[PDB]
Design an enzyme around this catalytic site. Structure first.
Site, PDB file in Angstrom:
ATOM      1  N   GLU A  95      96.708   1.661  -3.003  1.00 57.20           N
ATOM      2  CA  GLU A  95      96.665   0.307  -2.468  1.00 57.20           C
ATOM      3  C   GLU A  95      95.420  -0.388  -2.996  1.00 57.20           C
ATOM      4  O   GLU A  95      94.318   0.166  -2.922  1.00 57.20           O
ATOM      5  CB  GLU A  95      96.666   0.311  -0.936  1.00 57.20           C
ATOM      6  N   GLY A  96      95.595  -1.596  -3.527  1.00 60.80           N
ATOM      7  CA  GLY A  96      94.488  -2.324  -4.110  1.00 60.80           C
ATOM      8  C   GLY A  96      94.502  -3.807  -3.808  1.00 60.80           C
ATOM      9  O   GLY A  96      95.244  -4.267  -2.934  1.00 60.80           O
ATOM     10  N   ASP A 112      89.688  -4.762 -18.326  1.00 59.98           N
ATOM     11  CA  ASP A 112      89.551  -4.088 -17.036  1.00 59.98           C
ATOM     12  C   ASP A 112      89.732  -2.583 -17.187  1.00 59.98           C
ATOM     13  O   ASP A 112      90.509  -1.947 -16.471  1.00 59.98           O
ATOM     14  CB  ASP A 112      90.540  -4.641 -16.012  1.00 59.98           C
ATOM     15  CG  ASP A 112      90.145  -4.310 -14.582  1.00 59.98           C
ATOM     16  OD1 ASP A 112      88.972  -3.949 -14.357  1.00 59.98           O
ATOM     17  OD2 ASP A 112      91.009  -4.406 -13.683  1.00 59.98           O
TER      18      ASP A 112
HETATM   19  C1  LIG Z   1      96.122   0.526  -6.518  1.00 57.77           C
HETATM   20  O1  LIG Z   1      95.617   0.151  -7.790  1.00 57.77           O
HETATM   21  C2  LIG Z   1      94.830   1.160  -8.388  1.00 57.77           C
HETATM   22  C3  LIG Z   1      95.586   1.746  -9.566  1.00 57.77           C
HETATM   23  C4  LIG Z   1      96.618   2.780  -9.112  1.00 57.77           C
HETATM   24  C5  LIG Z   1      96.268   4.229  -9.452  1.00 57.77           C
HETATM   25  C6  LIG Z   1      94.948   4.644  -8.826  1.00 57.77           C
HETATM   26  C7  LIG Z   1      97.375   5.176  -9.029  1.00 57.77           C
HETATM   27  N1  LIG Z   1      96.182   0.676 -10.370  1.00 57.77           N
HETATM   28  C8  LIG Z   1      97.320   0.590 -11.104  1.00 57.77           C
HETATM   29  N2  LIG Z   1      98.258   1.507 -11.293  1.00 57.77           N
HETATM   30  C9  LIG Z   1      99.189   0.907 -12.116  1.00 57.77           C
HETATM   31  C10 LIG Z   1     100.333   1.418 -12.614  1.00 57.77           C
HETATM   32  C11 LIG Z   1     100.934   2.739 -12.424  1.00 57.77           C
HETATM   33  C12 LIG Z   1     101.981   3.174 -13.245  1.00 57.77           C
HETATM   34  C13 LIG Z   1     102.551   4.431 -13.093  1.00 57.77           C
HETATM   35  C14 LIG Z   1     102.076   5.288 -12.100  1.00 57.77           C
HETATM   36  N3  LIG Z   1     102.534   6.583 -11.832  1.00 57.77           N
HETATM   37  C15 LIG Z   1     101.861   7.093 -10.855  1.00 57.77           C
HETATM   38  S1  LIG Z   1     100.623   6.106 -10.150  1.00 57.77           S
HETATM   39  C16 LIG Z   1     101.032   4.855 -11.277  1.00 57.77           C
HETATM   40  C17 LIG Z   1     100.463   3.601 -11.430  1.00 57.77           C
HETATM   41  C18 LIG Z   1      98.741  -0.471 -12.421  1.00 57.77           C
HETATM   42  O2  LIG Z   1      99.258  -1.342 -13.121  1.00 57.77           O
HETATM   43  N4  LIG Z   1      97.549  -0.586 -11.738  1.00 57.77           N
END
Ligand SMILES: COC[C@@H](CC(C)C)NC1=N/C(=C\c2ccc3ncsc3c2)C(=O)N1
Length: 335
Positions: free
Chosen positions: A23-24, A142
């Site tokens: 969650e962000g 970023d």
């Molecule tokens: C909550 O944001 C922090 C951060 C998330 C991570 C710490 C998990 N941001 C992030 N994730 C992205 C994509 C993505 C794609 C595939 C996948 N498969 C397992 S997790 C996951 C994420 C994106 O576009 N932004």
């Protein structure tokens, strides 16, 4: 956002939520089962219904369609987008499912650094992946451990004397690069950047114009954080960030100080810094020259810190490119 995300929910009449992966500020990432593709597990990015985050999500979809077409095999380790759709007005992007982010793994591992041989493989793949972005006239802007994700984060546990605690270790340290909501083309309008992270290149802070080199700066900060377990610039204030650079890297170049319109940071030709205030006392204790952060004088450690110092070059033009960074002696062991 709190209402359309729980487990058991079905999205687009095919994706069934089974877990929350993060969650962000932009929203949520959830794990789903795609019932129209043999039950393939996918990751779905749920974006808040806010103007700035919707516009970023739309730009990210356009960038991902370009990268999927330019690199269908995903040879350069950018995350593959499967499709996108809308759900109760929120934009949703479906991704191939990856493992934990490098920040997530570090945290769930008690904030212990990675072994040097894993940093080498990760740094190489990060440089190749972001060089692919730069070859296609793109800047990520970023780059941070949260946006670097392991393809598969299975690990093993073992006790470590000297650390006197249990230590996790990756089985396969292969990674992918994610989050292209801020990705900017060379022909596009270049902003002056949000609270991007404790990774802000000096040309970004001083509003001297930015492009591909600011990605190289972020990677250098990623490497030292991988090597230490913590960032070397623990701050969100810009002037405090500049004061940390001067302690760790040395004085700012005179030409950069001369041209910048951010007079707010400077008193004549020096940084307007009170080293006896609360922040000044913190910067003194928390910061030291870069080489003093080294944990061993082994040559492979000096090869890494040689790469970091080149990536942390103040001048964006002198700063090493990722094309040159991939030819560095630190990556000779991989060849
Ligand atoms: C909550 O944001 C922090 C951060 C998330 C991570 C710490 C998990 N941001 C992030 N994730 C992205 C994509 C993505 C794609 C595939 C996948 N498969 C397992 S997790 C996951 C994420 C994106 O576009 N932004």
């Amino acid at each position: 956002m709190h209402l359309i995300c729980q487990s058991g929910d079905v999205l687009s009449a095919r994706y069934e939520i089974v877990d929350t992966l993060g969650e962000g500020a932009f929203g949520k990432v959830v794990e789903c089962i795609d019932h129209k593709a043999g039950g393939r597990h996918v990751a779905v990015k749920i974006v808040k219904n806010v103007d700035r985050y919707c516009e970023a999500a739309r730009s990210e979809i356009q960038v991902l369609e370009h990268l999927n077409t330019t690199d269908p095999n995903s040879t350069f380790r950018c995350v593959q987008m499967l499709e996108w759709f809308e759900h109760h007005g929120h934009i949703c992007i479906v991704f191939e499912l990856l493992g934990l982010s490098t920040y997530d793994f570090i945290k769930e591992n008690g904030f212990l650094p990675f072994r040097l041989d894993h940093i080498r493989k990760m740094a190489y793949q990060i440089c190749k992946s972001v060089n692919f972005l730069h070859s296609n006239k793109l800047t990520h802007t970023d780059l941070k451990p949260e946006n670097i994700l392991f393809v598969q984060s299975d690990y093993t546990e073992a006790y470590n004397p000297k650390i006197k605690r249990d230590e996790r270790t990756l089985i396969n340290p292969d990674i992918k690069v994610v989050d292209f909501g801020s990705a900017t083309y060379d022909d596009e309008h270049h902003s002056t950047l949000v609270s991007t992270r404790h990774y802000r290149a000096p040309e970004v802070i001083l509003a001297l114009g930015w492009s591909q080199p600011c990605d190289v700066w972020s990677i250098g900060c990623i490497l030292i954080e991988y090597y230490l377990g913590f960032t070397v610039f623990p701050t969100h204030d810009s002037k405090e960030h500049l004061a940390m650079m001067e302690r760790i890297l040395g004085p700012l170049p005179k030409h950069m100080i001369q041209k910048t319109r951010k007079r707010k940071y400077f008193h004549h030709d020096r940084l307007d810094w009170d080293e006896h205030s609360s922040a000044g006392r913190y910067v003194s204790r928390a910061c030291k020259p870069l080489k003093e952060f080294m944990l061993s004088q082994d040559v492979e450690h000096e090869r890494l810190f040689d790469l970091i110092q080149k990536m942390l070059e103040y001048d964006p033009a002198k700063r090493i490119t990722l094309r040159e960074a991939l030819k560095h002696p630190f990556f000779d062991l991989l060849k």
